Amino acid sequence: GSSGSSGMALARANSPQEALLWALNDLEENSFKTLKFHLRDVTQFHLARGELESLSQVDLASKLISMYGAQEAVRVVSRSLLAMNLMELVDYLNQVCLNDYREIYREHVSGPSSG
What we know:
Elements: H1 16-26, H2 29-43, H3 59-67, H4 70-84, H5 87-95
Helix pairs in contact: 1-4, 2-4, 4-5
Family: Belongs to the NLRP family.
Domain Pyrin: 8-99
Subunit structure: Oligomerizes. Interacts with PYCARD. Also interacts with CASP1 and IL1B. Interacts with NOD1 and components of the NOD1 signaling pathway including RIPK2, NR2C2/TAK1 and IKBKG/NEMO.
C-alpha cells in the first residue's frame, strides 16, 4: 500500500477542542460504532438507558470537555484507540496536548491564570 506524505498533523487547528472534534469525525461508521461502546469501558459512568446512544460527534466532543476537559479528553480517546489498534489516530492526538507545569513552590513568571 505504502502510505505517508511528510508530516502528521492533518488539520492545523488553534485549539484542543478542534483537535478532539476532528478525531471523532474522522472515525468511520464501523470504527465509531465500535468506539462508542468502548467509551463506557473507559468512562465507567452511568451513561446508559438512552445516554450513550444520545451522544454524537458533537455531543461527545462537548461532553468529554464538560466532564473532564480539552486536555484530558484527548488523553482518554488515545487510551481507547490503543484497544482498537489505531496508532494513526493515537499519534495525532498525542501531538496535540498542551500541559507543561514545572515546580509548584516558586513557579512565578507572569501569571498563568488571568493574564
